[PDB]
Design a protein around this ligand. Sequence first.
Ligand SMILES: [Ca+2]
Length: 764
Amino acid sequence: SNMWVIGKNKAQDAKAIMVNGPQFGWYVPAYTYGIGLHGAGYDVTGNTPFAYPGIVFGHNGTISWGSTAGGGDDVDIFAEKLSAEKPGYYQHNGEWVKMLSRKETIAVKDGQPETFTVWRTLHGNVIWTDTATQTAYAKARAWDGKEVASLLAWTHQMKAKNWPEWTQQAAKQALTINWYYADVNGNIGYVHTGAYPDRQPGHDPRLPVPGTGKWDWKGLLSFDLNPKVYNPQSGYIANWNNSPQKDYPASDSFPFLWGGADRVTEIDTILDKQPRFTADQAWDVIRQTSRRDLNLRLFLPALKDATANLAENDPRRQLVDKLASWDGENLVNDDGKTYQQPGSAILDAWLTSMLKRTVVAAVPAPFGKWYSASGYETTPDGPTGSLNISVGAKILYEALQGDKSPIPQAVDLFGGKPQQEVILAALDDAWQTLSKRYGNDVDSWKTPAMALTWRANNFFGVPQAAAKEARPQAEYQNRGTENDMIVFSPTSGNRPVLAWDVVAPGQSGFIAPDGKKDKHYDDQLKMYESFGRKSLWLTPQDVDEHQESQEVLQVQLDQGEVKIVRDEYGMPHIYADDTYRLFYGYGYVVAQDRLFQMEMARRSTQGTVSEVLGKAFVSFDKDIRQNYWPDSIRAQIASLSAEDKSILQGYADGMNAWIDKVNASPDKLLPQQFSTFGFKPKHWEPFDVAMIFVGTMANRWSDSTSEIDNLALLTALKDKYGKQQGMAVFNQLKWLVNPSAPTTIAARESAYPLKFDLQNTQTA
Ligand SMILES: [Ca+2]
């Protein structure tokens, strides 16, 4: 997910420009949903994942906002001490506390039900039980009990009109998410939002902690500690899942690192090269970064050095010369199947061999395979997500920097041999594999282009469309699933704010019972591929001028009225006078456009897919039910103010108003996929609505930990290198902080004050 916010001092013909490209993968129907809300204090336009009541990507005429995943460490694992004689009890503060438990049965269409029990302790749900050590590992999220509040903070921030008002909602968003701000006066800002634990001294957040009491969190850190910047000296805020600020620690996941090698530098390079950007140039950064090879910039200096004494007759030299004449941009040939230059295939083969010889060799099996990927891994279907610098490559980059790197190399990744020797040896392996395939002349190689697929299964692996709806795209583009731009105070024109977005394949996922696709089923698919965009309307004049349909709806609760106006791309605009009615119109239009997708997202987020699709989804259903506690979500809803509750209730009731019309005349209104898969849509509740957010936002982007795997790795590293050196190798592969990491907030602005204790920890 990427973002670039350009302020007053860096914007040309405008006061501020915001460009967001969140990366969620490619699906049909679209991952995000375009929506306009007007009334009850709301006047907002934009698009949002899974049609959440809160619009994640948008603006309100005064401020614009967006987000990328935060990548912080908000999840810790508590190793609970089990009892030999007491089943279902654990030790906390000298006593034997009983575990909460709940029994679940997964109903299976044409199959056998599957029963199991989910366990929960004061730390969280139990994710794993090791009988040998009598340990139950419990997952503690700093945001547990704040799921519904995080959804409502995203909804209320839509009404903010300045920095203090917006940061007040940013403080109530408990998930690890980067939030961005821009306004009509040219002010830009950034907050790395979330609830983060206040840990005991010597708590290494990369490894599990005993859950007996001595290591329980002292509570949560204050919002004052969260990295934030307002109008940075640089005049821009750029992010591509990189570090928010100097000394700020990343998530404990072993593949996730923030080091000297970071893809955000690709955006920083473009933004620093010129002093001012127009709206069209800011948007063009998408085209540029989408085609950028991320490894050329990192390894070309070492490759030129290793082949400096070679003449042009040497094949290893011919490979580096081909890389040295390349601009790093990948373009597809007229055939639609191959790249114009072979550089990425050369870097892929070289990196794969380099990693086998360096990082993979140093790490004992079966942990070596964790650092073997080159970052180019793809199938004929194309990459399912973004392309990044791999974890192995990030560690290899530190070793290549050597002296320049702040990471102590506790083990020489080059195993005694000089690095030039290893670099030429990997180049020879790359030459051998690539010449066997394309012949001995590098100038004639037509290497395969990465393709893209708009998947008919959601990110969970569950159908959200018939398989036949999957669409191919010849060019893979390392860009957002959607891209949106907001331009504040443009010098040209009679509008104080301009916005655009692209929601492909289209605004609608509706396919009629006879197979007829809606007019807005795929009318944005070609616009996406060609880096085009469509206008986002906010004012009633713009909405009414570009309208295509207009209808009134009578809310079933109070016979009140809601006006729905759809634009030329099918994007609905809701007009209502109270909170309940507003969200009722929203849920109603979601049910008209994305019923089959939302119903499948509902079953995916609650683990009820097998009920309608069969035994294939049983392990998926079980794992979803094991990863949440329904009573906590229901308690969070039950304790909402009447205003916050009307948002969820209105939305659910609005969906039910359309579902009833659908079930009254299925032969004309039932989405075709309900007939293809053999079931009917049913009513939604505020629970269902909250669980779409929890299951697809909190669980997908804010629930990442690999502490148990980290412990297994550290245990093997101590076995190989000894207790002392093994821990120092762990600090070289999975460092807590790396000061050379490119950061969204400049070091000049501020740094993370919280320093961590290395000596004496839970691993002593
Ligand atoms: Ca952690």
